[PDB]
Amino acid sequence: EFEEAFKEVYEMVKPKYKLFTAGPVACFPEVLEIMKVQMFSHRSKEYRKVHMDTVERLREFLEVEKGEVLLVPSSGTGIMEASIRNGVSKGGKVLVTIIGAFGKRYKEVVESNGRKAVVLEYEPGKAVKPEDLDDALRKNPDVEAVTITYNETSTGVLNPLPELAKVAKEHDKLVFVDAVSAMGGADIKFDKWGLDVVFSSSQKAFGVPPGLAIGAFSERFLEIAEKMPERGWYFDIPLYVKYLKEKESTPSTPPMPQVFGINVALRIIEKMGGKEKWLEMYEKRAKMVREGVREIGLDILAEPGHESPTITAVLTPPGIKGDEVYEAMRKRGFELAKGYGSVKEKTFRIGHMGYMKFEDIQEMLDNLREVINELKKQKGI
Amino acid sequence: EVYEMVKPKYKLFTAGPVACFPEVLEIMKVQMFSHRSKEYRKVHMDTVERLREFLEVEKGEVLLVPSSGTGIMEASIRNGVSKGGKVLVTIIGAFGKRYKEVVESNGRKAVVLEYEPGKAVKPEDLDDALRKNPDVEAVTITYNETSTGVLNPLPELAKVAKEHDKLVFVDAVSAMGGADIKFDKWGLDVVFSSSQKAFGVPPGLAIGAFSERFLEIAEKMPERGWYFDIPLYVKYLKEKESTPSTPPMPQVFGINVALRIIEKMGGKEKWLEMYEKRAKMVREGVREIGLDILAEPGHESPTITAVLTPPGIKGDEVYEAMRKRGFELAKGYGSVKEKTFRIGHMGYMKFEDIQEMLDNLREVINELKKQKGI
Ligand SMILES: *Cc1c(COP(=O)(O)O)cnc(C)c1O
Ligand SMILES: *Cc1c(COP(=O)(O)O)cnc(C)c1O
Ligand SMILES: [Cl-]
Ligand SMILES: [Cl-]
Ligand code: NA
Ligand code: NA
Secondary structure (H helix, E strand, O other): OOOOHHHHHHHHHHOOEOOOOOOOOOHHHHHHHHOOOOOOOOHHHHHHHHHHHHHHHHHHHOOOOOOEEEEOOHHHHHHHHHHHHHHOOOOOEEEEEOOHHHHHHHHHHHHHOEEEEEEEHHHOOOOOOOHOOOHHHHHOOOOOOHHHHHOOOOOEEEEEEEHHHHHHOOOOOOOEEOOOEEEEEEEOOOOOOOOOEEEOOOOOOOOOOOOEEEEEHHHHHHHOOOOOOOOOOOHHHHHHHHHHHHHHHOOOOOOOHHHHHHHHHHHHHHHHHHHHHHHHHHHHHHHHHHHHHHHOOOEEEEOOOOOOEEEEEEEEEOOOOHHHHHHHHHHHEEEEEOOOHHHOOOEEEEEEEOOOOHHHHHHHHHHHHHHHHHHHHHOOO | OHHHOOOOOOOEEOOOOOOHHHHHHHOOOOOOOOOOOHHHHHHHHHHHHHHHHHHHOOEEEEEEEEHHHHHHHHOOOOOOOOOOOOEEEEEEEEEHHHHHHHHHHHOEEEEEOOOOOOOOHHHHHHHHHHHOOOEEEEEEEEEEEOOOOOOOHHHHHHHHHHHHEEEEEEEEEEOEOOOOOOOOOOOEEOOOOOOOOOOOOOOOHHHHHHHEHHHHHHHHHOOOOOOOOOHHHHHHHHOOOOOOOOOOOOHHHHHHHHHHHHHHOHHHHHHHHHHHHHHHHHHHHHHHHHOOEEOOOOOOOOOOOOOEOOOOOOOOHHHHHHHHHOEEEEOHHHHHHEEEEEEOOOOOOOOOHHHHHHHHHHHHHHHHHHHOOO
């Protein structure tokens, strides 16, 4: 009846580019289709069934048996905040490992919530070393938890989580993991690696629209949380666990479309053969992108052996800014990602998450080569 | 596979989420892109601007937040009330109780002014409560209590609060878009809503409006966090025309479509009159069946009605009975979930759909009475 109301907004949001973004990312058509289904009550038997099926699929995917998996109505950073209000004493110290922009965000989340942050920082492109963590924990024995950015989206680096988590546990510390750009793209074995908190978002490796956060919490974390004073209501983890058990839903209204979308995404992974084959696909995309930029004669930021399977930070040739590549590719129909953080000018990024065909990547790379050559000639280099 | 579990199977008269317009559902499936792109910044600001217009906000700030409405309920407390500070929480239903829970769980103290389900807060009672509670920093008001179908006299209540120089926090989750709101004019300091009620958009997004006074306090408020740091959201809106973290883009697009629909129908005035017309139709419809509502005279909600079931009949029975007829109403909520069931009148629903729902409700009531020997 109000076609024009729809058409007016469509003109602003209609598909314009082939997406190689850092999040949100291109969603699979099956996911987009479920996003338009009519709503109904989140307290209904119909919804409770879907909410729980999604949680079950995530417990399987994340290999969680002893801990709890929750769906939260917020972006991933919501659980980042939750980890601090629930698992660290007021004024308590947190050893925040920083290898990029999001490690810095965790620090801000720690401090803004009344906790203290002890930093172990590296230059963009480097990954945290287990030996340095052990060293840091040695001289900072009063810290209660350690945060690890599994996949640093600003640098295209994947931290060696298993080994880092091992070291943290040897010091009997809580392990908090920001896996926003890692979950669904890099493996996570929650119980086995001894993680206490891991969180992610719907709009990265899972290829679902933004609006939902996914969290997994250990028994150890939950025991501390239920006794943690003034942790609030919106991110009261024990409250969420109680609602999941009793009402098979969330305390407040959940982002239903995104939940349906994640369920579809999990079924897609199952259809293709399971988690292993899905992660294999991600590694093949990453490889193709890295090898492709290498052919063009460009270097990447990530140190060898720690390259991200979800995104690559490419260093621009001398005299060219990341923004210039971003804008030039857009004019050719390709949306990459601007550099982020302290390397925003010396790099641009290429995401390889969500709906992405190998042929589209190849086409993107051929256009990038021309963009690079043209910018060089343009500037006389 | 998933479509089977979520496919449409009921005519919706829910308490939230609600039935969304076809236009809104269609925009919900558009492909995503960066929330840091020029394309998204344009849509984010257009939506915020249409909301500032709708809410009549000029001096304050309007924000879109990645959370359900309760998220801003929490934000109001962490940003506008000193730690250990006192808040006068007015309660007339289940959600007033939630605000109380949010106040206490965040380390603040709640002073309660509570009424039995069906009643509305009286400006005179609020005035007396405030005189006896001088240390109170803010007053919370549930504009539209969804569990009882009651609309509080916000303008008059906000008036009293300001007379005592208190901050005015308003839970308008089931009110915004269904009952008028004049932010600047009424002196409100915080008002928040969700996408899944009167606006008829899927859940996942929260809307908030904040006054200069509130922001001044928030900026100096220690340890208010990051996710609900209002001044941070204002800064990102101003500089990045987006949110600090990733926003629920589909729902933002949906709210924009919804606001354009309101415009195309004649504007806010005509939209609100449409809501009152719908509510009046439901109230007379149930009263014609021989039923009464819970809301006290003059405080009937334009978005939802709490209907008292006949003696011997539970609200749940009517809910399940209607479901078998293809109609989805709402179970009673709170301490009256047995004596009442609810009929929401939000989102997409033609007057004819309401009539068809009312006719089936009549047969359902008689069928229930008959099987119960009534
Ligand atoms: C994208 C991202 C975040 C923020 O996720 P949101 O959903 O916007 O809150 C945090 N950490 C990392 C590593 C990310 O890539
Ligand atoms: C539905 C409702 C809420 C909660 O809204 P959410 O989006 O689920 O957080 C709060 N208050 C009232 C009056 C409501 O109707
Ligand atoms: Cl609810
Ligand atoms: Cl961001
Ligand atoms: Na602009
Ligand atoms: Na602006």
